[PDB]
């Protein structure tokens, strides 16, 4: 889908969810 | 989920519930990738041992949930099945290799700010993502322990695990097909699915676009949470072609 | 608990 994988209430709206934070942390 | 958190509302809009007609009753989670196809484990819908073998008529799909067990009015989606796809390959017989499904929904669900597909990986996310201590999220209304039920979709972010260590923590064999995940018994955290989140999706957000992408489907474990055990995932990557091939002809 | 009544609609 062309916008796959973006929340509304999320990425669209720049906003950041309570531990997305932790993933992306552990992507060396 | 075993040692989650409540997820925050629109969290995994692509969260969707495999639900049974009669009895009413929650069978496995599953996943939005279009307007018309839902993606879970074959497992859910087939599985000899335990007399298992659903047909479209046996369930619904509701998308767009948060609480477990409330009927969520002008909030989720009910759906009917249209026809269900199995790997024609699955071995349920032994390890559950090819643990992997497709669902047509009668007909296309529009989205909202609760209802939004997840993407499928590239090679490229695939391989830059599926690496041993890189973390990836868990959802699901299963069980909080193994042996109740939460009030809310769960949500748990967890390591993947080198393939190795895998293999060492089971008799069962594993094949490229899968990829397992899970803490350590020395990293000091828990966590992993349960009854109920099975067929689920295991997603990462990729740090070069921001889009989540499902990697896995909660696919096997040998009970929840145990040390020194680890949850089983299909390699969506690795099955891909399978899925454009069905979707493509069909 | 158990689950919450859904439509009619659904079930047919
Ligand atoms: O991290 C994970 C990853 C996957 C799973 C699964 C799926 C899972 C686990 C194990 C198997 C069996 N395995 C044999 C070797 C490889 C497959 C299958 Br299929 C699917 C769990 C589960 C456990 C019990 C259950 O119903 C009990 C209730 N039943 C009593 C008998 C019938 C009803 C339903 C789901 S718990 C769990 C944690
Ligand atoms: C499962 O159900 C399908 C469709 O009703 C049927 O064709 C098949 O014989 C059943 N058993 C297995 C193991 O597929
Ligand atoms: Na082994
Ligand atoms: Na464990």
């Not at chain 1, 994988?5 to 309570?18: A, N, V, Y």
């Not at chain 2, 390890?95 to 497709?102: K, P, V, Y």
């Not at chain 2, 080198?162 to 293999?167: A, G, N, Q, S």
């Not at chain 2, 040998?222 to 055990?229: A, I, N, S, V, Y």
């Given at each position: 889908?062309?916008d ?21 942390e552990?992507?060396? | 989920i075993?040692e989650?958190?409540?997820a ?7 969260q969707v519930?495999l ?5 009413q009753?929650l069978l496995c989670?599953?996943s ?11 497992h859910c819908?087939?599985?000899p041992p ?9 369930l ?11 009927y969520?009015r002008?909030?989720?989606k009910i ?8 790997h024609?390959?699955?071995?349920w017989?032994e ?8 669902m047509?929904?009668?007909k296309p669900v529009?989205?909202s700010?609760?209802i939004?597909?997840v993407?499928?990986?590239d090679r ?5 993502l ?10 699901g ?5 193994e ?12 390591p993947?695990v ?6 060492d923590?089971?008799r069962?064999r594993?094949?490229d ?6 803490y350590?018994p020395?990293?000091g955290?828990?966590?992993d ?8 999706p295991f ?18 474990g ?8 680890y949850?089983?995932?299909t390699?969506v990557?690795?099955?891909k072609?399978?899925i ?7 | 608990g158990?689950?919450?009544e ?7």
């Open positions: 889908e062309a796959c994988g973006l929340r509304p209430l999320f990425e669209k709206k720049s906003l950041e969810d309570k531990t997305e934070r932790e993933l992306l552990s992507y060396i | 075993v989650g958190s409540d925050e509302i629109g969290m995994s809009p692509w519930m639900f049974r007609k009669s009895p009753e989670g599953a939005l990738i279009s307007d018309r196809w839902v993606l879970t484990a074959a819908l087939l599985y335990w007399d298992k073998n659903f047909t479209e008529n046996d619904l799909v509701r998308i767009g949930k948060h609480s477990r067990t409330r969520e002008n909030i989720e759906s009917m099945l249209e026809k269900i796809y199995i024609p390959r699955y071995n017989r390890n559950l290799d090819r643990d992997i499904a497709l047509k929904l009668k529009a989205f700010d609760y939004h597909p993407c499928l990986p490229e996310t695939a391989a830059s599926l690496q041993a201590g890189y973390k990836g999220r868990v959802t209304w299963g069980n909080l322990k042996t109740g039920q939460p009030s809310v979709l769960q949500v748990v972010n967890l993947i080198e393939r190795p260590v895998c293999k923590s089971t069962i594993i094949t097909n899968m990829f397992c995940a899970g350590k020395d990293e955290k828990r966590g699915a349960c009854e109920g989140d099975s067929g689920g997603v990462m957000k990729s740090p070069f676009n921001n889009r989540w992408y499902q990697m896995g489907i909660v696919s096997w040998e009970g929840c949470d145990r040390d020194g055990k949850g089983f995932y390699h990557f690795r099955l072609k399978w454009q091939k069905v979707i493509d002809q069909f | 158990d689950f919450e859904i439509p009619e609609e659904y079930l047919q």
